[PDB]
Amino acid sequence: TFISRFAPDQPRKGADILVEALERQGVETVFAYPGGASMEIHQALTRSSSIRNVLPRHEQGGVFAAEGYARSSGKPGICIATSGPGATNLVSGLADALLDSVPLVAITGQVPRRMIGTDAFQETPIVEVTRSITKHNYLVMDVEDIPRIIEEAFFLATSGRPGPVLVDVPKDIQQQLAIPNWEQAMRLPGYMSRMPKPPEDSHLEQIVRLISESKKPVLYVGGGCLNSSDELGRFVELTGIPVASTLMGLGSYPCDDELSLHMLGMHGTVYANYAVEHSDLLLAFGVRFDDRVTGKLEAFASRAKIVHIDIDSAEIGKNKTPHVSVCGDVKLALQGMNKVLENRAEELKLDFGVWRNELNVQKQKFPLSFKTFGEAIPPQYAIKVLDELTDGKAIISTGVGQHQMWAAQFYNYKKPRQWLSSGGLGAMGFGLPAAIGASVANPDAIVVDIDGDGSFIMNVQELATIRVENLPVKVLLLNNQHLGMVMQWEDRFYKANRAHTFLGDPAQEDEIFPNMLLFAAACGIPAARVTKKADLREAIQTMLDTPGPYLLDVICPHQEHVLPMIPSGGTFNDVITEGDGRL
Amino acid sequence: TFISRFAPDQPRKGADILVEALERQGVETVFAYPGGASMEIHQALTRSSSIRNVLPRHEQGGVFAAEGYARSSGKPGICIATSGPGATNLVSGLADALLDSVPLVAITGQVPRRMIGTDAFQETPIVEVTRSITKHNYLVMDVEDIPRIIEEAFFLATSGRPGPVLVDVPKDIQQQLAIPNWEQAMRLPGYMSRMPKPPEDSHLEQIVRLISESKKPVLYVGGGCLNSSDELGRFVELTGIPVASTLMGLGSYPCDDELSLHMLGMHGTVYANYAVEHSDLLLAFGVRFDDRVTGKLEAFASRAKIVHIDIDSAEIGKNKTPHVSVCGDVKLALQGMNKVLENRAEELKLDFGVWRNELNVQKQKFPLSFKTFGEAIPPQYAIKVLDELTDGKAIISTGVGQHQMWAAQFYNYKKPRQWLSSGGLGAMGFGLPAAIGASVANPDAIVVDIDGDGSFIMNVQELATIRVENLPVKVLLLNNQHLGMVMQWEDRFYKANRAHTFLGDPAQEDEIFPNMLLFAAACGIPAARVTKKADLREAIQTMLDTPGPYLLDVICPHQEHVLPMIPSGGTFNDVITEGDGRL
Amino acid sequence: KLEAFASRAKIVHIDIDSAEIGKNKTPHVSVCGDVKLALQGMNKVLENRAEELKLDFGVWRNELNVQKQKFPLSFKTFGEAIPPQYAIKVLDELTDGKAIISTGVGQHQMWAAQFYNYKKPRQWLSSGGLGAMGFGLPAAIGASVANPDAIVVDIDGDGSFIMNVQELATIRVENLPVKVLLLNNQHLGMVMQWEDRFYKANRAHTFLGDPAQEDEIFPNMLLFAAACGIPAARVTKKADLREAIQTMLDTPGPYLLDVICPHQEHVLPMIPSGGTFNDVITEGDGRL
């Protein structure tokens, strides 16, 4: 039962109703940045003894923190901003949450209802702006609509295919006195009728049938399996089917396991892409068949009967037509198939050892490889050292670029929700704030931000947030003095013609710029720089063993390229396994 | 005549067509941040020997720099970003440029045409998103449409009421070979028919008539007069009418002049608001009657015949009904009235000395005042010192908050386009990037960023941009360790109840946090901190006399309040002249 | 009710629009493409592998043939009053089912779909999704222009026919051999049927005649045709119906046949909205 701070017959501000509405949703943490149009909400937040506010130094840092909080917990992330400039600073995070299907609730202040559409002070039609980059949004036009809208907002954000929901609240609504009705029915009759029912036995038994008739089965696991870790692992034990994962699905199946083909796709391993290329059965669970993965669709799993399980019917048959499809929760689908696979185990006698050995061969000839030059630190090596010293149990948030790929290639994630990274939108500056939210959601966990020098500096102001909130956030900065990912394409497709990809100072080219250590020192965060590979192990260890925040500036040669690589719209035969930025 | 780098019969990439299209528009400077969907454009930029690119460390810094470039020159500002996260980082700047009517052209990369609407890699419906926060936008669907669209984009952004125009360019269009047609007619038949004609003699002679019949005339000058500095000054000489200016219109009429009532509005001077309150003739030139200025409309200039001149017919009669209106260029309207006022000078014999003396009285009893506590630095005093040492000829960009108001109150701007500040949207983090763009547009000018500790840290990453580009940007940081503006409202309207407005470290409360000096040192920018008022003069002098970038951390007591203040929706009788955050 | 629709069947869905595959029901097998090509592909497989497959669904067909015997499409004849169902089946016989049929929307639309055996596609022109009244007569015009040598008949209701009655002028001026088989029940039959069954026969503006002269057919649709120089006639007795329809066909050019039917007729069978097969209604009308 819930205990309010107000009498059931006592009127109170709409702002207080809003906060209590969050308390009834089990909200424990918000990321709010105050402003004139949201002061009432912030005032009401101080009256709450159950909701903690983490004040960012930028609303983009605020919404990205809400993502990290969400991605690393399964809970919805909540960020609050003021009208106008505050709201527009949330845009990237909203679009990011929609593309990666992250459960998130964003609340923005707004000018009074009578002042809407008058080009008023700090007024932005944020609903009109964010309609195409949110799952749903609301504009509260009455104080009595607050309890219903909030309940709907959290329901829409967390149910079905998770996503961002924005609620815009006019300032006069926040100030209006009212008595809230908490037991009013939600008004989403359309959405709920479209909600997928539990998978039928007929569809599940058809999948198991295809499995027994296949000789080269491959699991195509994505971000939809983040809550099906136990069920998926159980499924693999019963089938012995190798697992290829997406960027979003890392950790769903343990990467240190023998049956893990790791990641497939543009920068996926050679054997993962090989497995799908020559498969005769493709089990696509919780994926959306992105062109970063498939490449040229007509060649992607061309000889395989495709099984697609998704909770969004709009994704089933969009890019490729599946021979068997199940519209519903993959968690339930696995549970249903597991019981069938166990009671009929002796009858089926599944054994894909021949196929697994064929894949194990490819795993031997073409493994993930990097090269060591003298005492220069390989970015790949640094990440694998972090894996060993954290035993692969750390929560890893990243920016976007070369460092992002290496963080996905050279770290074996034991469990899901250790891997926090912008996949669909691929937004830089995501790493540091996401680490903040993850650390708040998981206080006792090892949280490390594997960032690039370009991505890190974008939201560097959040270092202040980290110190003030006393969060044990570790920052493993892979510094190549460049926008590496763009630089790589320049080397390979544009004859190494540099077009504004150098981030250092041309006046003093052999000096590391900027001095990221002084950024940390500005926020009272202990930091250090490592250049020699021999000094790397103790440096990373020091970062971990040192209590609280820490920044490790790892200097790497910028000539490194992410391998392997399948060019855009390319096939498996177009894979690139050699080459870098050196001559 | 223009000289291309390509033969008239030679095919070339759409990206090269785009860049040449900018060259033909006289573009000398762009603010572009590279990405996968805009690499072709950046490659084409390197082939240009006339277009300089200033690489920011964040696209928001990129678009804000384009604003400062535009606001301080009259030229359109050009910023370029990649698809998805790059585009969404421009949103705040686009909305900012629309509300303050700033001429700006934003170019964003986009996924291939065939991949649009497929939730593709880094895809954002930026046209759908920014339709309500831009003047116009485009989605290029053919390479041959590039020259026409670019010409229309610059035309729409600079003509009539200036504003932001976004052009979204799919990557496949950038790569497609074609031969551009530069002499094709623009397709804006509707917009051009609505373009205001030069003001008729009948309307102008009606205004002059009202002037001769008035005894208490007041000039209501705004951002629409930024190009009418000479004409306005000439108009004042012929009439002797006192000048009240908006936040956006500062500098249009010299503030050190005797007839200058400085700024009116919520935080406008007592005598400026008094003048409008008791006027019998209100000459509203280049204003939009914002509620920050008028307050309660029904009481704003209640006894005055109102003359409104605007280039946008949608603004004339929106909030208040004028007795006389002229839809057109205020520059031409002034030119027309000046010739009439001079040839009919001896016949009119205008003399508002009695009214001016009445205002001069109010100017004596209620002047702009601040208080000095011991050796603590008054933020107001620091700004007035900057005025004296720069002789009021410096370009001033600000963030948003208390420091923004004091920068507008205690600096006498001799000319327009010295004052760069977010007025309509009021976006924090605007100051530093705007200073960058202004410094690039005006290399020989003194550029100073009067920033707040909250606003400064939001886009602190642009300090790297300043050093790399070697820009003589001065940063006068008024540090109150708080979000002052919100804090002020807390003190006055919420019983000083702090709701996340403190920006320092609660663990070490008497220590200035963060150490902004180390932020500058990280980017190799010389910096210093001043605490005692006696040391302030030489400190500011040192900042100016030191070549190149410089950061001065000015520590001020946070108990200071911006005065005077008319509460929202209030009248002149509700003005607050006393009080601070002290007890 | 979707959950009960083909509940025990493995579903194969072939559509050229991927947005339709898996929208309402999840198919066990789906093909996104031209059904014409899908049939062509399956036909070649079914023929070369014919002796291997040996398909035979005679038992299932006999089970269905049984249901076809016990519950066939049925109507009732009252004295010499013309059954709308009978009139349409007569049109079928006299046109040998080769005529192009356009309809309005309502009871007459359903009977035109139930009691006419269409040999080929594109003989049946009717608003299905939107179900727009007044569609029949203009659609007949366009069909007659596209198919000059074809027998074009508009099976219309008195409500649907009058909505776009002005197109009778178009028919005469363009000299189109459009036949108009008007099933006149003096009501908005479809709405009237729901009134009888779900609202205790409470008439809510469904009568189209003149209350002042209730036993007179209103309006006189024959005069509508005469206004546009179109030969027309009215038939009331069932015995006179056969020669009347024959006259309509044998008469060159446009023709309007005003067929008067009792308004108490109901369209059968009927499964209520959101209902299942067990909820099917096989009996009942507007009579007491």
Ligand SMILES: Cc1cc2nc3c(=O)[nH]c(=O)nc-3n(C[C@H](O)[C@H](O)[C@H](O)COP(=O)(O)OP(=O)(O)OC[C@H]3O[C@@H](n4cnc5c(N)ncnc54)[C@H](O)[C@@H]3O)c2cc1C
């Ligand atoms: C520089 C860069 C390079 C990249 N290269 C690669 C690469 O090489 N390989 C790669 O894989 N990615 C890569 N990406 C990321 C890529 O763009 C996408 O993020 C990813 O490919 C798509 O993830 P997904 O297929 O798992 O689907 P997701 O984006 O994770 O969406 C989840 C899907 O599962 C469904 N779903 C969700 N919940 C459930 C449930 N409970 N039950 C059933 N279904 C559910 C959803 O409806 C949705 O369709 C890269 C990104 C960047 C920035």
Ligand SMILES: Cc1cc2nc3c(=O)[nH]c(=O)nc-3n(C[C@H](O)[C@H](O)[C@H](O)COP(=O)(O)OP(=O)(O)OC[C@H]3O[C@@H](n4cnc5c(N)ncnc54)[C@H](O)[C@@H]3O)c2cc1C
């Ligand atoms: C914290 C804060 C406090 C603020 N308080 C105040 C305050 O106290 N006082 C104040 O004044 N502002 C204040 N503002 C700013 C305020 O919100 C607006 O920016 C300002 O009041 C409106 O400017 P404006 O009236 O000059 O019109 P603008 O926004 O400058 O628009 C220009 C107008 O002139 C027209 N125009 C443009 N060009 C021409 C031309 N060539 N010929 C004719 N017409 C043209 C345009 O159509 C437009 O209508 C504050 C902002 C902030 C962030």
Ligand SMILES: COc1cc(OC)nc(Oc2cccc(Oc3nc(OC)cc(OC)n3)c2C(=O)O)n1
């Ligand atoms: C904390 O400092 C400031 C400063 C300021 O103006 C400079 N405004 C606000 O809050 C708003 C934010 C957005 C729009 C606003 O306009 C507004 N809001 C109202 O809500 C009660 C009423 C009102 O009547 C005119 N105008 C307001 C407003 O409070 O004036 N806060």
Ligand SMILES: COc1cc(OC)nc(Oc2cccc(Oc3nc(OC)cc(OC)n3)c2C(=O)O)n1
């Ligand atoms: C499949 O065919 C194509 C063709 C094309 O243009 C020729 N673009 C895309 O997708 C993108 C969408 C957005 C940015 C893109 O550039 C890009 N993509 C990367 O994918 C990880 C990385 C990267 O590093 C610079 N650039 C790309 C890109 O594939 O080039 N796909």
Ligand SMILES: C/C(NCc1cnc(C)nc1N)=C(/S)CCOP(=O)([O-])OP(=O)([O-])O
């Ligand atoms: C510019 C760019 N992409 C374009 C871009 C621009 N802006 C944003 C917000 N996001 C993206 N993805 C990348 S991945 C390079 C970033 O380089 P990095 O952060 O230093 O990492 P690394 O050099 O290891 O690739």
Ligand SMILES: C/C(NCc1cnc(C)nc1N)=C(/S)CCOP(=O)([O-])OP(=O)([O-])O
């Ligand atoms: C939070 C806020 N306004 C809400 C807000 C939030 N986010 C943005 C981008 N813009 C605004 N205007 C202000 S003015 C306080 C800023 O304080 P400051 O930058 O340190 O300046 P000062 O303390 O002198 O008022």
Ligand SMILES: C/C(NCc1cnc(C)nc1N)=C(/S)CCOP(=O)([O-])OP(=O)([O-])O
């Ligand atoms: C009112 C109605 N439906 C509502 C309606 C209203 N308006 C239009 C344009 N279309 C429709 N479908 C029907 S089906 C009754 C029409 O009666 P009818 O044209 O005389 O045919 P019948 O009486 O045999 O059902």
Ligand SMILES: [Mg+2]
């Ligand atoms: Mg880098």
Ligand SMILES: [Mg+2]
């Ligand atoms: Mg401050």
Ligand SMILES: [Mg+2]
């Ligand atoms: Mg009828």
